[PDB]
Amino acid sequence: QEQVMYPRILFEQMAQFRGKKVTVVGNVCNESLVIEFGQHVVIDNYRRVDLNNTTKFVEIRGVVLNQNIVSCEELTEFEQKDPFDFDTYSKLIHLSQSDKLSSLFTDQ
Amino acid sequence: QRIYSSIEEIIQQAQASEIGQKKEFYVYGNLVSIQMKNKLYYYRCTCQGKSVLKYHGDSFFCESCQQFINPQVHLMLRAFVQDSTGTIPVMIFDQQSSQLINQIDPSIHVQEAGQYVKNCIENGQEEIIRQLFSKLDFARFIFEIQFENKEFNNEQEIAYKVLKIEKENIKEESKYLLKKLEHLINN
Amino acid sequence: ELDIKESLKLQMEYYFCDTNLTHDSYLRGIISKSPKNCVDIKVFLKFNKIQQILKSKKDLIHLIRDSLKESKILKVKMDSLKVKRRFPFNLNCLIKIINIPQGTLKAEVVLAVRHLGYEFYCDYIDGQAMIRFQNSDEQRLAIQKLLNHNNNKLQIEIRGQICDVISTIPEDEEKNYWNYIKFKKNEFRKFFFMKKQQK
Amino acid sequence: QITVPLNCFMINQIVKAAKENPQAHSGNHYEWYGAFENAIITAKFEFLQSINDSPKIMGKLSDSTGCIEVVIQKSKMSDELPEFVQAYEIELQNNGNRHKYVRAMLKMRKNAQIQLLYFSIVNDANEISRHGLDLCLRYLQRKHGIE
Amino acid sequence: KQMLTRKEDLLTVLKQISALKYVSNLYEFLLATEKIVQTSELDTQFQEFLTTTIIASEQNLVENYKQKYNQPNFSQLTIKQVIDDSIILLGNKQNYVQQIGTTTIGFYVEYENINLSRQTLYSSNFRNLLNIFGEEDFKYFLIDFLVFTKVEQNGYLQVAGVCLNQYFSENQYIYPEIQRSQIFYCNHMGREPGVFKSSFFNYSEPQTIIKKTLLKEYQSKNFSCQEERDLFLEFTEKIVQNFHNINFNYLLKKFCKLPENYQSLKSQVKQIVQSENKANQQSCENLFNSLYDTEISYKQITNFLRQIIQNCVPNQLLGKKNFKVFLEKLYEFVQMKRFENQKVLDYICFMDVFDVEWFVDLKNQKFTQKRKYISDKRKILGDLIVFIINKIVIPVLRYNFYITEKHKEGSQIFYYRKPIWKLVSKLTIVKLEEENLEKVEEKLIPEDSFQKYPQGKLRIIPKKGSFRPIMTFLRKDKQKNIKLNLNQILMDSQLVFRNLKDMLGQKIGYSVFDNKQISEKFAQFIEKWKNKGRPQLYYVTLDIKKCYDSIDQMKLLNFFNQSDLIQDTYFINKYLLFQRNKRPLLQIMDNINFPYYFNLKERQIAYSLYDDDDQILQKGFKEIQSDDRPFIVINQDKPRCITKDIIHNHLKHISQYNVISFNKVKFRQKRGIPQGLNISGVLCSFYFGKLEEEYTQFLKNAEQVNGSINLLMRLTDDYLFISDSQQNALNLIVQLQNCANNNGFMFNDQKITTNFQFPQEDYNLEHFKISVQNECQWIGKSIDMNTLEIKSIQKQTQQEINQTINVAISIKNLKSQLKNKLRSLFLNQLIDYFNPNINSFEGLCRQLYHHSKATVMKFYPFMTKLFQIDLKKSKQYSVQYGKENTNENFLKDILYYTVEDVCKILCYLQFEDEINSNIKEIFKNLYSWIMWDIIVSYLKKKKQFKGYLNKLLQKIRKSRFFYLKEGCKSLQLILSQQKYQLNKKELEAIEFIDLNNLIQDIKTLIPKISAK
Amino acid sequence: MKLLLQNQNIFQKLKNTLNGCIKKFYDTYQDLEQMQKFEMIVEDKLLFRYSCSQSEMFSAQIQAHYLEKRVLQLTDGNVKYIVNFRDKGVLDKANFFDTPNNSLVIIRQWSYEIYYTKNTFQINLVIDEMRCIDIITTIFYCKLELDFTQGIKGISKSSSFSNQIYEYSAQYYKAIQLLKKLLI
RNA sequence: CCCGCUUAAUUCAUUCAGAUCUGUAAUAGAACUGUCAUUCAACCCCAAAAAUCUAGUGCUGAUAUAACCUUCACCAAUUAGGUUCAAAUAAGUGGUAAUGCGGGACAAAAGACUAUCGACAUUUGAUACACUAUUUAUCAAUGGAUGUCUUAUUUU
DNA sequence: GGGTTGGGGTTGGG
Ligand SMILES: [Zn+2]
């Protein structure tokens, strides 16, 4: 119907795009939704308290602003009772960026 | 630490084995389609009674012990362990099957399983057992699958058996796939 | 002998005539209680004067059988043992249970005590169960277990509940209960008198 | 006829190429380094209230690459819903309409819609990395099996 | 009334079953749901497939399948994919026809076997049907409905739905069983009399070792307290000690003693064994008769058992009266036939529980709950009785005696002393090791066969002047991995040979195998005989002697290798069949399932891969029906393969290296094939059909060369040749004797039961002994050479009839058992030769008369056994028949209803459907009257029936007479209404009714019927 | 199901038909007019087509077909065969239920055909009539096979691994030896 | 016909296998020891019937030329004589069981019992416990039940 | 560590 692409990137690659539709995932930072990645934290637009209580992990689809701030268009949470691995996720993202496999995730 | 292998490698290394070889592997499969056209249990004494003297009127008397025994029910299921590579028909014995039945319904005890199944069947309540077995479809697990290249009625045949049925852990399966794919790209 | 068998048949006919078994009616019991009115000869040997004709029981059996085949009032066939005629020729302790669940049937309370194994008479009314015995020894023999010494409390199990009981009823109540058993026992008498008077 | 894990963009490209080049074998099987019929995918399932559709209940699987539209089925003798979707309705009513990722096995044939055979709710982000890695691995396995 | 019709439509029959709410053909279902319209076009083939296919449904579902106009029905899928989706929709349910020979795994269904009905589901008709339905409705039509598709003139095949064979299917106590069958065939004999050395009387012998060897009785679950266990152990020790004080020699000498001249017989047998040269022959007959004339009578062994029990078991163990009753019933236990037996209730229900003194109760229920006490103590008394019998009476008989039945006596039982039977065994070994058997050393047998096939065993049945051997192959070698007896190994070859047998009726000889074929041949011959004008007839009868031992293995294997009726490869398919029984349609209580109408039978068949005209590859079955009534077939997923080479190997083995054991010494045949194998019955007929075909060329053309009819039939042994020209019979005897001389067999006893006489010198037939009779007495039949009508031969005395009936009565389901027994005992042999083409009307009446007179005597023991139990104590029958004289009403009910059913079946057998109904009614009443007259006249003299039942039976018979007369009196008016035109058979029926004057009474007919 | 196809003893059928082929061949061509013998040996033209009898009707399961090189692959438990078929009519006549692959066929009639090739002979196998009897889907892992489209190497391969293949390869070699010795 | 007691003595024979002894012309005789057996015993072919049997009659006016009834063992077959929808007196055949001792007075139309028993005895319904052909208990209803005497003599 | 499927019933021809 309507193809709204939303690739995934690491934290450093956020500084490489500087404005584009992407999807980034992170764990909530406990004290205007704000979540820590990986120690570097990122800030967002969603109402921090508005999300459900049990949810500990989040993934957002939206456009990245200048840096460290991202407007969230799509918000996903789940009660992840297990420690979210990160290095495997970074490997998966890098393989998505690989030339040998780029023809699978995104067009061109 | 263990070394895993998919269903394709198992089926391959099984169809290239001579009579008398046994082997075990570990798979990140999932179980499906517990068959039900056979009988779902058998009888056995406590002292490893090979043959149990059958009687009428539900009387029972073992021979490896030679005392009037309360008959014991060991339920044995048959199902299919599959993956993103293949499928294999396996047989599940008393302990594993009881573990499964208990995981799907914690009310029934790991030792009450066979009696529960037999009473439901003989009473005339199979629909409940059918739905209970249906609730296990596509349940992810970690299997220890054993295969043996035996021969029955002078006919060569391969048989697969399941030894350990454990809950799954995505954090390790992910690392397994990652290291395998790294090896695959590196060559 | 020939004369012996003749006299035997004659005496058996004189004592077999239904007129004798009617005026005396002695052999009437043997005739009736017989299977098919065919009495045996083993009852003839117990006679008094028949032995006087004796002057090997089967020998005398066959002799009487011959003396009867020569006769016609009686009958004998197949030289059998039995004989028959050829004509019909007809013509100080009692206690009380209490605290019973009200409305409970008589069966429960009566069987819980019949477990004793000895008879008794019980009258149930809402809790009050007046029980009486016919033997005095059974009271002391039964109180050894019905009065459970584990608790030393007079308790009986009925319908899933504990019920109390007393070991001795008052003496004035005992005399009144004796007079009440007389009332009901003499009530049988007035019943039967009315039954005799209705006509 | 074996299951293959892939993402929404791959479904879109496959169906596009199938509808563009009908000069293939006259069989319902698609063609992606082989003849596949089933698919496995983890994605954001959410209902799609269509217009006057009694037997079918259109769905949708958003994802970080594209977006597809699946169809569910319902029992004929009793106009109710399957188990795996009734559980999802219950869980969505509980949390207050917060759509979660699910892992779905679905059968796709050509010149017809894409049914959804089964799905299960997921509550662990490692499933996402597992699915991506499964996709890449099986793709490489099929490609090097073609050569 | 609800008679039996000869033609029925499956649609009509299905409408009667109450479980099915809606049944119809597929065409009307498609017109109802508006999937098509009569204004549309359909080719003739597809429209006929829509008209004949029948569908059924347990709920009225025409509404749910109504045409929804939301989307047109354009299908892009195949048929396999739709069927796969349906089977997936089924899920875990495990009984559906479209699910045979396949397994569902996940969302993928796989096929693993040969369901021969898939051809029907994946044909073009079902493709067009899917086009008509559309997928989303086809997927559920294959589940909600039962679809039978006609594939044969009347036979339907079920291709989708629930399997019909699924409609054909708190606890209590069950007393043990007395293993009587253990007493019969024991060939052992020890030095000193008694019981086996393995019995508990002789085990290593202290009550402790007794507890050790009686570990099955000392710890039963019926003994309340350990006190009772020890109390009973004491009695067992006293039993053992009393047993060790018996000298069996004196006991055997007292009651059942050897003959006075036993030493003479021992010397004669030893002499016959010693002499290497062949001894005399008639002396051997006299010796066998002198040996068989030494059987112990029933009273003699009964006294023996009573006397051995009286001083072996304490009196109070059972009670003073219980012991007496037990000793009294022991006789009945002795004199029962082979397949009869006693139940523990027979003893229990006549014993008392409060007579056993050593019983005890933990709770004192002897007064509170007396009934529960009686139950709990019966559960012990029954085990006591089973112990006594199965541990004292059975081993003593099995050890000291040999118990078996005579050849001609039937099922009666005979007891022989042990030494006498050892002598008979020796003499038989001698008389048998000279002709065909011979001893053998396991050296000569090849080891491949030795490890493949199992062995057999030998039994001997005493015969008038000789013996009768029997070979049994039931054993299997547990060791060496042989899990099937020899018959179970030859089953497949037997299937192939049955397929062969279906072709020997007219191709390579003159063989018959069943009464249907014989009756058909007789019908044809009677037709030709009536055509020619009923000339005089002659016949001849003769039979081979020991056929199975007269066939040469070489000629048999040669005839096998060079036959073309036996293909090279066969496939075996297994299926199952629902056929129509004899229950008439119940004109329309609301609980009538399938088994009320259909009989289930599981069958197998072997077909050939050729393009045979039977086209079994399409259907999967081969059923030859006798009427136009439907039947359903469903295939199964159990195919096999058989090859001519494997059958060749089996034949070579069983014809060369067949070794059988006896008394732990082995024997092996020298010529012939072993009788006792499933395969031999057809092999003998084939081998002899070849030979007789070689020598009977003149019969092939003697029907037109000179115009002479002649029938020649043969079972496995017996010949029968009816003809019109004596010269043909003479030529037949000459050719048969010539063939016998040429091939090495001879006819039994040289007894030729002919009809004429002739000089036996002009044909070198002096050694035969012709016997002249005027009625063909073939196998249990009496063909009358003046009217050529057939009927059976019945016994004449109550004893001869009783010798072959085994009563077995159980209080559980009397009502069904007795009715079925009467139904069978009537329809056993009468059903085949009741053909209206063979016999005339009077012939049929006479046949029914004599057969009923025989079957009443056959049934009588069942009634006398029924009266031995009072039913008033059983609520199940007293609630339904009353509390006084319940047996009388019960017996009257079962008699009446079975006689009515039999009359209906006879009317079904005699007439067609086109006949008027009043004729059928008159003949039904006539047969009912005949049967009831026989019954009443046979029972009016007995004692158990004399009082009150005879009144009921007389009333019923008088009623049947009145109804017959009334029907016969109204038929005249109904016919004189002129609305009906009579065919020839109805005119014949009318002629028979008016000739015998059935208006007044039956007096004119009984002379023509009771005359023998 | 594996045993049902196993019991057919296909190798006996192949041996008998091969025997009949060579027998009738050197029976019908004993003229030995060397001019006609040179005329007969032409490349890519069938020298002799022997139809099979009616007793050699075996069944098998189709595992893979190829329409351009008209190749068929069948199997039965242990062994699998690679053969040819005459034309597309062979397929279209046998009423397949769904598809050529994964279906149980019975061969009503097949035939041997002899070709002359480079420096040697070659004997092929051609299936002429089939019929689909049922569908079966059970991947059989056949250890060994024989190819009737690769000359002698197609059969002699895996000869050591089974007695029956050994005997059939021996008979095939004897047949081609007699063939090349008769005409040449 | 019912009830209680009782019913006897050495071997009629010793298959198969093993180990001893005695004389020999091939045999014989003496005495001893182990013992159902592939843990199981049951022959096969073909053909006939098959309700989960509380579910089923035109529940039945006929042919005194008919149907019943009559015998001291018992039963099952053969002949004589009576009766009018049921009642009592016979005669030839064939088979089966047979030690002895002891008992077999209510027979009844009532009368008398104030003897008895709320512990009498039936009959029904209800409730328990049982059921494969149980010999019970309590309640209600009901009135009769029991032991003795009178119409009575071992030629019984 | 399991595995045709063990039956129940017993008439009449051979
Ligand atoms: Zn044990």
Q: Report DSSP state, residue E596.
A: G
Decide if C159 contacts C103 (C-beta within 8 A): no
Residue C167 within any structural domain of the chain: yes
Angle at F72 between CA F80 and CA F152, to 5 degrees: 60
Chain-centroid distance, C-alpha E702: 40
Question: Which residues are registered as beta bridge partners of E539?
Answer: E722
Residue type, E216: K
Decide if D31 contacts D110 (C-beta within 8 A): no
The set of chains that have 3 or more CB pairs under 8 A with D is: A, B, E
d(CA E938, CA E853): 8
Q: Report DSSP state, residue E256.
A: S
Using alpha carbons, select from E59, E58, E36 the residue that is nearest to residue E46.
E36
d(CA B154, CA E666): 29
Is any atom of nucleic acid chain G found less than 7 Å from the CB of residue E248?
yes
What token pair was written down for F108? Answer: 């009503």
Between residue 397 and residue 416 of chain E, the positions with Cβ below 7 Å from nucleic chain H are 411
C141 and C106 in a single domain? The answer is: yes
Beta-carbon neighbour count of residue D130 at 10 Å? 26
Residue type, E385: I
B60 and B121 in a single domain? The answer is: no
| 3-state SS class at D120 | strand
**Which chain B residues have a beta carbon less than 8 Å from that of E215?**
66
Domains of chain E from N-terminus onward: 180-258+294-419 (1.10.132.70), 798-1010 (no CATH)
The residue behind tokens 């069942």 is E862
Nearest nucleotide (C1') to the CA of residue E515?
A: G47
CATH number, domain of B60, equals: 2.20.25.10
Angle at B74 between CA B73 and CA B75, to 5 degrees: 110
Decide if F77 contacts F162 (C-beta within 8 A): no
Q: Report DSSP state, residue C48.
A: S
Pairing of the two strands E467-472 and E456-462? antiparallel
The minimal CB distance from E80 to the residues F12, F98, F138 is found for F98
Task: Please give the full DSSP string across E388-413, using - where no structure is assigned.
Answer: HIIIIIHHHHHHHEEEE--STTTT--
Residue type, E487: N
The residue behind tokens 């059939």 is F168
Residue D146 within any structural domain of the chain: no
d(CA E13, CA E11): 6
The residue behind tokens 């939206």 is A62
| 3-state SS class at E894 | helix
d(CA A31, CA A44): 15
Q: What are phi and psi of E711, to 5 degrees?
A: -105, 140
Between residue 847 and residue 876 of chain E, the positions with Cβ below 7 Å from nucleic chain G are 868-870, 873-876
Question: Which residues are registered as beta bridge partners of B143?
Answer: B27, B165
End-to-end CA distance of chain D: 19
* Residue range(s) defining the domain that contains residue B62: 43-74
Residue D78 within any structural domain of the chain: yes
End-to-end CA distance of chain C: 66
d(CA E485, CA E952): 54
Residue B139 within any structural domain of the chain: yes
HSE at residue E975, side-chain half, CA atoms within 13 A, is 18
Residue type, E419: P
B82 and B113 in a single domain? The answer is: yes
Decide if F129 contacts F109 (C-beta within 8 A): yes
Annotated binding-site residues of B read 45, 62, 65
Burial status of residue F179 (CB atoms within 10 A of its CB: 0-12, 13-18, 19 or more): buried
What token pair was written down for B163? Answer: 């030894």
d(CA C124, CA C109): 8
Decide if F112 contacts F83 (C-beta within 8 A): no
Closest chain B residue to D117, measured at CA: B138
Orientation of helix E886-910 relative to helix E841-866, angle to 10°: 160
* Cα-trace Rg, chain E: 34
Decide if E835 contacts E789 (C-beta within 8 A): no
Residue type, E808: A
Decide if E399 contacts E195 (C-beta within 8 A): yes
Closest CA to the C1' of G130: that residue is: E371
Residue type, E319: G
Using alpha carbons, select from E147, E181, E182 the residue that is nearest to residue E162.
E147
Orientation of helix E984-995 relative to helix E949-976, angle to 10°: 130
B52 and B88 in a single domain? The answer is: no
Is any atom of nucleic acid chain H found less than 7 Å from the CB of residue E779?
yes
Q: Report DSSP state, residue A84.
A: P
**What are the Cα distances from residue E78, in Å, to B125, E98, E131, E663, E746?**
38, 17, 10, 68, 68
Residue type, E336: M
Q: Report DSSP state, residue E795.
A: -
Residue type, E150: K
CATH number, domain of D90, equals: 2.40.50.140
Residue B2 within any structural domain of the chain: no
**Which chain B residues have a beta carbon less than 8 Å from that of E174?**
56-57
CATH classification of A11-97, choosing from 2.40.50.140, 2.40.128.50, 3.30.70.2740, 1.10.10.10?
2.40.50.140
Is any atom of nucleic acid chain H found less than 7 Å from the CB of residue E793?
yes
Q: What are phi and psi of B103, to 5 degrees?
A: -65, -35
Decide if E891 contacts E871 (C-beta within 8 A): no
Provide the residue ranges of all domains of chain A, joining segments of one domain with +: 11-97
- What technique determined this structure? cryo-EM
Residue B68 within any structural domain of the chain: yes
Using a 7 Å cut-off to protein CB atoms, list the covered nucleotides of chain H.
1-4, 9-14
CATH number, domain of C62, equals: 1.10.10.10
Distance C87 CA to G89 C1' (A): 8
d(CA E214, CA E383): 13
Pairing of the two strands B159-166 and B87-92? parallel
Beta-carbon neighbour count of residue E781 at 10 Å? 18
Chain-centroid distance, C-alpha E168: 21
What token pair was written down for E364? Answer: 């004192």
Task: Please give the full DSSP string across E414-450, using - where no structure is assigned.
Answer: EEEEHHHHHHHHHHHHHHHTTTT-EE--TTSS-HHHH
Put simply, the answer to whether A88 touches B181 (Cβ < 8 Å) is no
Residue D118 within any structural domain of the chain: yes
* Residue range(s) defining the domain that contains residue C35: 2-85
d(CA A92, CA A74): 22
Beta-carbon neighbour count of residue B41 at 10 Å? 20
**Which chain E residues have a beta carbon less than 8 Å from that of D54?**
68, 70
Residue C178 within any structural domain of the chain: no
B61 and B135 in a single domain? The answer is: no
Reported residue count of chain F is 184
B158 and B170 in a single domain? The answer is: yes
C43 and C75 in a single domain? The answer is: yes
Which contacts (CB < 8 Å, 24+ apart) does range E314-317 have?
A: E314/E235, E314/E238, E314/E239, E314/E242, E316/E356, E316/E357, E316/E358, E317/E235, E317/E358, E317/E384
**Which chain B residues have a beta carbon less than 8 Å from that of D3?**
84
Residue C183 within any structural domain of the chain: no
Decide if E894 contacts E871 (C-beta within 8 A): no
Percent of residues in chain C assigned helix, strand, coil, to nearest 5: 45, 20, 40
Task: Please give the full DSSP string across B13-52, using - where no structure is assigned.
Answer: HHTT--TT-EEEEEE--EEE----SS-S-EEE-SS--SS-
Residue type, D92: L
Q: Report DSSP state, residue B91.
A: E
Annotated binding-site residues of B for Zn(2+) read 45, 62, 65
Decide if E100 contacts E90 (C-beta within 8 A): no
Strand spans (E) along A1-108: 21-28, 34-37, 40-44, 57-64, 69-78
Decide if B101 contacts B117 (C-beta within 8 A): yes
Decide if C8 contacts C70 (C-beta within 8 A): no
d(CA E177, CA E462): 30
d(CA D41, CA D120): 11
The minimal CB distance from D64 to the residues A8, A77, A85 is found for A8
Put simply, the answer to whether E137 touches D76 (Cβ < 8 Å) is yes
The H or E element containing residue E135 is: helix E135-144
* Residue range(s) defining the domain that contains residue D23: 3-139
Using a 7 Å cut-off to protein CB atoms, list the covered nucleotides of chain G.
1, 5, 8-16, 33-58, 60-63, 67-69, 72-77, 88-91, 96-98, 100-107, 114, 117-119, 127-139, 143-145, 152-156
Using alpha carbons, select from B70, B37, B35 the residue that is nearest to residue B52.
B70
Put simply, the answer to whether E367 touches C111 (Cβ < 8 Å) is no
Between residue 879 and residue 908 of chain E, the positions with Cβ below 7 Å from nucleic chain G are 879-880, 892-893, 896-897, 900-901
C101 and C77 in a single domain? The answer is: no
Using alpha carbons, select from E571, E547, E559 the residue that is nearest to residue E499.
E571
**Which chain E residues have a beta carbon less than 8 Å from that of B33?**
103-106
Total number of domains constituting chain C: 2
d(CA F168, CA E989): 75
Total number of domains constituting chain B: 2
Burial status of residue E118 (CB atoms within 10 A of its CB: 0-12, 13-18, 19 or more): buried
d(CA E851, CA E834): 11
| 3-state SS class at B149 | coil
Residue D145 within any structural domain of the chain: no
What token pair was written down for A24? Answer: 């980034």
Distance C90 CA to G117 C1' (A): 39
**Which chain F residues have a beta carbon less than 8 Å from that of E562?**
none
The minimal CB distance from B33 to the residues E106, E173, E220 is found for E106
Residue C106 within any structural domain of the chain: yes
Angle at A48 between CA A46 and CA A50, to 5 degrees: 85
Beta-carbon neighbour count of residue C63 at 10 Å? 17
The H or E element containing residue C150 is: none
**Edge-to-edge order in the sheet of strand E719-723:** E538-540, E719-723, E710-714
Total number of domains constituting chain D: 1
HSE at residue A62, side-chain half, CA atoms within 13 A, is 19
The residue behind tokens 């109408």 is E597
d(CA E83, CA E519): 48
d(CA E104, CA E99): 9
Beta-carbon neighbour count of residue E376 at 10 Å? 16
Domain boundary among C43, C60, C85: C85
Task: Please give the full DSSP string across E166-234, using - where no structure is assigned.
Answer: GG------------GGGGS------SSSSS-TTSTTSTT--HHHHHHH-TTTTT-SS--SHHHHHHHHH
The residue behind tokens 């003739």 is E44
Residue type, E289: N
Put simply, the answer to whether E115 touches F137 (Cβ < 8 Å) is no
Beta-carbon neighbour count of residue E758 at 10 Å? 14
Interface probe with D: pick from A76, A91, A106, A108, most Cβ of D within 10 Å: A76
Decide if E718 contacts E541 (C-beta within 8 A): yes
Orientation of helix B94-104 relative to helix B113-123, angle to 10°: 80
Helices (H), E744-874: 798-802, 814-827, 841-866
Task: Please give the full DSSP string across chain D, using - where no structure is assigned.
Answer: --EEE--HHHHHHHHHHHHH---S-SSS---SSS---EEEEEEEE-----SS-SS-EE--EE-SS-EE--EE---SSS----HHHHHHHHHHHHHTS---EEEEEEEB-TTS-BB--EEEE---THHHHHHHHHHHHHHHHHHHHH-
Q: What are phi and psi of E685, to 5 degrees?
A: -65, -40
Burial status of residue E834 (CB atoms within 10 A of its CB: 0-12, 13-18, 19 or more): buried
Residue type, E158: Q
End-to-end CA distance of chain F: 46
| 3-state SS class at E260 | coil
d(CA B150, CA E719): 56
| 3-state SS class at B74 | strand
Beta-carbon neighbour count of residue B128 at 10 Å? 12
C9 and C78 in a single domain? The answer is: yes
Residue D124 within any structural domain of the chain: yes
Residue D55 within any structural domain of the chain: yes
Q: Which residues between 39 and 68 in chain D have a beta carbon less than 8 angstroms from any beta carbon of chain B?
A: 40
Write the CB contacts of E406 (distance below 8 Å, at least 6 apart in sequence). E292, E412, E414, E461, E462, E463
Which contacts (CB < 8 Å, 24+ apart) does range D9-18 have?
A: D9/A5, D9/A104, D9/A105, D9/A106, D9/A107, D9/D63, D9/D65, D9/D66, D10/A104, D10/D65, D11/D39, D11/D41, D11/D66, D11/D68, D11/D108, D11/D114, D12/A3, D12/D66, D12/D68, D13/A107, D15/D108, D15/D110, D18/D110
Using alpha carbons, select from E569, E528, E220 the residue that is nearest to residue E386.
E220
Closest chain E residue to B38, measured at CA: E94
Resolution, given in Å to one decimal, reads 3.3
What token pair was written down for E710? Answer: 């002649």
